[PDB]
Design a protein around this motif. Structure first.
Motif, PDB file in Angstrom:
ATOM      1  N   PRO B  27     -56.624  -1.775 -82.301  1.00 23.91           N
ATOM      2  CA  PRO B  27     -56.075  -2.710 -83.284  1.00 23.91           C
ATOM      3  C   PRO B  27     -54.819  -2.179 -83.964  1.00 23.91           C
ATOM      4  O   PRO B  27     -54.827  -1.080 -84.521  1.00 23.91           O
ATOM      5  N   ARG B  64     -55.653 -10.125 -77.703  1.00 26.45           N
ATOM      6  CA  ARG B  64     -55.977 -11.094 -78.739  1.00 26.45           C
ATOM      7  C   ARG B  64     -55.101 -10.827 -79.956  1.00 26.45           C
ATOM      8  O   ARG B  64     -54.810  -9.671 -80.275  1.00 26.45           O
ATOM      9  N   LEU B 137     -53.015  -7.429 -83.725  1.00 32.57           N
ATOM     10  CA  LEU B 137     -53.405  -7.477 -82.323  1.00 32.57           C
ATOM     11  C   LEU B 137     -54.636  -6.611 -82.083  1.00 32.57           C
ATOM     12  O   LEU B 137     -54.793  -5.550 -82.694  1.00 32.57           O
ATOM     13  N   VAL B 138     -55.508  -7.075 -81.190  1.00 31.42           N
ATOM     14  CA  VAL B 138     -56.634  -6.294 -80.694  1.00 31.42           C
ATOM     15  C   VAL B 138     -56.536  -6.303 -79.171  1.00 31.42           C
ATOM     16  O   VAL B 138     -56.781  -7.333 -78.530  1.00 31.42           O
TER      17      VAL B 138
END
Ligand SMILES: [Cl-]
Ligand SMILES: [Cl-]
Ligand SMILES: [Cl-]
Ligand SMILES: [Cl-]
Ligand SMILES: [Cl-]
Ligand SMILES: [Mg+2]
Ligand SMILES: [Mg+2]
Ligand SMILES: [Mg+2]
Lengths: 145, 144, 144, 144, 144, 144, 144
Positions: B27, B64, B137-138
């Motif tokens: 992350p 993601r 963001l992941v």
RNA sequence: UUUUUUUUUU
RNA sequence: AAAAAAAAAA
RNA sequence: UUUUUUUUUU
RNA sequence: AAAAAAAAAA
RNA sequence: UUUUUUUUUU
RNA sequence: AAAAAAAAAA
RNA sequence: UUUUUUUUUU
RNA sequence: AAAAAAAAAA
RNA sequence: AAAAAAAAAA
RNA sequence: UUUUUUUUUU
RNA sequence: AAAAAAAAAA
RNA sequence: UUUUUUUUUU
RNA sequence: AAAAAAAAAA
RNA sequence: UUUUUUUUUU
């Protein structure tokens, strides 16, 4: 696979995250050993860029396995012994393996029970190694955290 | 179960590997500008902050993204992702929008097996667009 | 069922204990500074406010935290926890974030059986980080 | 099983109570005089020695009594209990006697559900009678 | 069965251990003073009288205690045990009382798996209180 | 499982034994000369090195032996065992030989139930013959 | 599965079509004025932004609308859709309203099979009304 | 899992 | 669907 | 014994 | 609940 | 093939 | 619904 | 082994 | 997988 | 889970 | 009739 | 017919 | 009726 | 026929 | 768990 193209992911709310997770490993390293003298293996050997673990400062050791790494004295079969050490109180066990072919490594290990699986830091020692060979190869199963 | 140490009847020296792979979900946040696409660098995935500074390559599996700051006045958040690839960039703009102005917008995309090769620091994973100044963001990836 | 007192045919004097253990879920708040980690003291768990001032030790089982005040402007709440242990501190930063700016961020961690020993007032349970000035904790523990 | 800390995917802040109830069996002794009834004060149940000084009320469920010192020469121990209630006292005298001069006498009574209300420090539980100069009690009660 | 010696078709030299662990129940007595808690030294467990002087650590699993001499005049025996731990002492007072003045009082407590670590001579196991001048202990432990 | 100490409802004082028996596999080496039998002394089994110096007798159950050093040039290792007994020495010579010059020779014998009596330090277990200067033994015995 | 190129035993030349149909869900925004109905033009669907500029006709299947900007002070969002058809306009006003002031209002309508003919740039899909200055539409259609 | 050659039962 | 050749797996 | 590549038969 | 990566066991 | 850790899918 | 701690019952 | 109180998992 | 010698249960 | 459009396979 | 891509319904 | 102590098998 | 810790078989 | 209180039995 | 006395419900 099955699909040949990128596909959409219908993500939802932001999940729980952790940039610095734990890691279960089997760490291989060598130590030098003197004849008739026990070597205290430092936990600090387990934190290193060589293992991708220099970001950890603690580790839970689960098991220790040891192999002689150089040939033994003339006429002798290799042997290696392991005495577990614990900050709450050191053991007096001397788990030992011996080779049955002079040209083969001696090996032994021990498992730490769950009730004694606490963390260690670099200044701690894992066990004492004794051998008639001047080097011993260790593979320590542990949980970096 | 056991309460004391027990002997392990070890055999021959096993195959070993001091520097193994690692499947991770990383992350981090990127800054985003109005009407402008931010290229997400792969180098952001190698960092002591992730225990990953020993890796120089990574195989990205999925991305993601969530908006990280509030949207402009009167607006609902949105975020878009355009997959980038060394063998050829895509023109898809996967998009999610918020249905409540106080809520994050989110979207992601999966990379198919046939396109899961390695990327290095100088590469870019994807382009991010948003009406919010930051995106979280992941990224699910395999460090190797 | 019986409406009156009834005889009890008691036998020998039984084993007794005036000061038994107590499994509890203790809620308390801590103040947090921007960009600074706060070490949560175990002493906060012993208090007449929880009926626990008679205890001097406790075995912590799990730790959950929520942001307790609103986040900075334009931001979503977050909260991080880093477990601490007298035999060696961890470096995990379990993190939760809110996806609505008006909602708490939350996260927790479980302590494994092999790490459940006693702590006293001078010990610390974990470090807390957040963009909110207060965090609410709920700690599941065994007072003894 | 798990050897390391693990994340809890906490959600919303739960219902909490810093000062919960506690079901207990309290052991304490009373002094008793020959031919005189001693009224057992409920206040003996609120004490730091039982970790209960934060409570001010308690619902008694049952009372068991044992002689605690040896009886007069030539006699077997006996103990009697008469329940007291704020809505009206009882006239029962539940009694047990020893069959060996060297052994404790014992007896108990259960309170029915319809008479399980709260008592405070100034109230009394029961009257104790015995030919021994101390009696040991174990009271099963619900502190609230 | 066999009446003579028979050959054993031995193979390779096995894994050996000259100094193994030992699960034991160790009986010893301590002297106790009226109204004073006696700290039981772990060192009492290491002695040639138990075949254990070669050990320097032990994991205690449970502790049981009996009064070892008659009680004061008038009284029934009692014994109390408070567990001690290096990570934090307990405040429990597990207690048993005799119901015949001529009979030993007894009680014990079990250590949970998560609190079964090693102790050395300089450590203490528990406190003992009693109205009897001596207490007999039987401690279940694993020497290692 | 429980995470805290718990009460044990002990009863009467049990049968105890501070100096119990011990079934063991004891590893030790003996020096052997060329063409000469070496009488293995039972006293070698009682040693602080084995945690056994509190014992003065032992019942041997089986004997296994391995050559412990390399054999003379051009030869393969061999080792012989002749059981010895206080009621009458045997004349068996159980023998193992190596099939690889670099490997230990091994052999052993089992003592039948009718011959499993105690031996003291001045007794001898067996005679050992070998073309190697040292022999490693692992004797299965019951210390008592 | 195979790791190398493999032969395809092709047959006769197949039927081909370089400009096929395409079923799509087209998202776009339109501006809306207070108390005024906006006619959504069909031409909006033929845009290079959608990869559809090679089409000159489309068969509309269903229309869905969301408010895209915040409503006026004190109000909840609403949006209305009136289907339009070249053979005869409808007078329906399918309407949705937000139940949280911070959330979008949404509604749609489905066109029955008997009314699924083609529309061209100069045609209008529907009329939009809303108290928000922008409405976000997603139109499911078949380009041909 | 059982055959032959030295000793005890069915 | 089986078989032969090379490879991999068990 | 399954799968992959080449081949063959069906 | 299954799968992949590291580990352990079988 | 079961568990533990990371991930993913459900 | 099972489990851990206190209690009660069997 | 059932229930009551506290906790936890689901 | 049946079996012993010491410890926590039934 | 089925269906419609493009594709592939049978 | 199965799968992949877009869509839709559930 | 179940059983041992030494040898050629499984 | 069987779990952990010192020794023999499967 | 079941339950509650006292008693007796098992 | 059965029966006896008081009570209650049916
Ligand atoms: Cl708001
Ligand atoms: Cl803060
Ligand atoms: Cl007497
Ligand atoms: Cl010793
Ligand atoms: Cl309209
Ligand atoms: Mg928004
Ligand atoms: Mg908040
Ligand atoms: Mg609204």
């Amino acid at each position: 696979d099955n699909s040949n193209v990128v596909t959409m992911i219908r993500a939802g709310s932001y999940p729980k995250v952790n940039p610095t997770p734990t890691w279960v490993r089997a760490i291989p390293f060598e130590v030098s050993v003197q004849s008739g003298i026990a070597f205290k293996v430092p936990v600090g050997s387990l934190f290193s860029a060589n293992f991708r673990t220099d970001s950890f400062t603690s580790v839970t050791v689960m098991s220790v396995r040891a192999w002689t790494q150089l040939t033994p004295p003339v006429n002798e079969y290799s042997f290696v012994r392991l005495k577990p050490l614990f900050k709450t109180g050191d053991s007096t066990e001397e788990f030992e393996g011996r080779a049955s072919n002079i040209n083969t490594r001696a090996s032994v290990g021990y498992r730490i029970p769950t009730n004694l699986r606490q963390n260690t830091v670099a200044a701690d020692n894992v066990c004492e190694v004794r051998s008639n060979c001047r080097q011993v190869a260790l593979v320590i199963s542990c949980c970096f955290n």
